[PDB]
Amino acid sequence: AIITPALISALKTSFQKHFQDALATAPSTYLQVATVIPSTTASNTYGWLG
Amino acid sequence: AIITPALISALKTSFQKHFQDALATAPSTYLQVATVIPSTTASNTYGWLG
């Protein structure tokens, strides 16, 4: 006649991490639509002739 | 010739086991819809991070 706190609830229970980091995020797709340009200062300026 | 119909008429037979295992049962399928998580106590508690 063990008291409920020390029962299947807590005393008899094993922790498992099968659900961890299983639901993923949508795959990255920004490369297909955008291109990467590096920078090394506060801003970047672009110019073309015509 | 003449004989009781409970000895010869009963023993003039050849038992065969063709009918055994003639049919089958539906194949296992729960693998395609479930994973197997072994347990070592009364219950298993699961926890994952957000």
Numbering used by the authors:
A (entry chain B), B (entry chain C): 2 to 51
The publication says:
Bacteriophage Casadabanvirus JBD30, from the order Caudoviricetes, is a temperate phage that infects the bacterium Pseudomonas aeruginosa. The virion of bacteriophage JBD30 is composed of an icosahedral capsid, long flexible non-contractile tail, and a baseplate. Using its baseplate, JBD30 attaches to Pseudomonas aeruginosa via the bacterial type IV pilus, whose subsequent retraction brings the phage to the bacterial cell surface.
Here we present the structures of the virion and empty particle of siphophage JBD30 resolved using cryo-electron microscopy. The icosahedral capsid of bacteriophage JBD30 is built from 415 copies of major capsid proteins organised in a T7 laevo lattice. The capsid of JBD30 is formed by pentamers and hexamers of major capsid proteins. Unlike in phage HK97, there are no covalent bonds linking the capsid proteins to each other. The positioning of annular loops extending from the axial domains leaves openings in the centre of hexamers (7 Å radius) and pentamers (6 Å radius). These pores were suggested to serve for water and ion passage during genome packaging and ejection, and putative scaffold protein release during capsid maturation. The empty JBD30 particle remains associated with the cell wall.
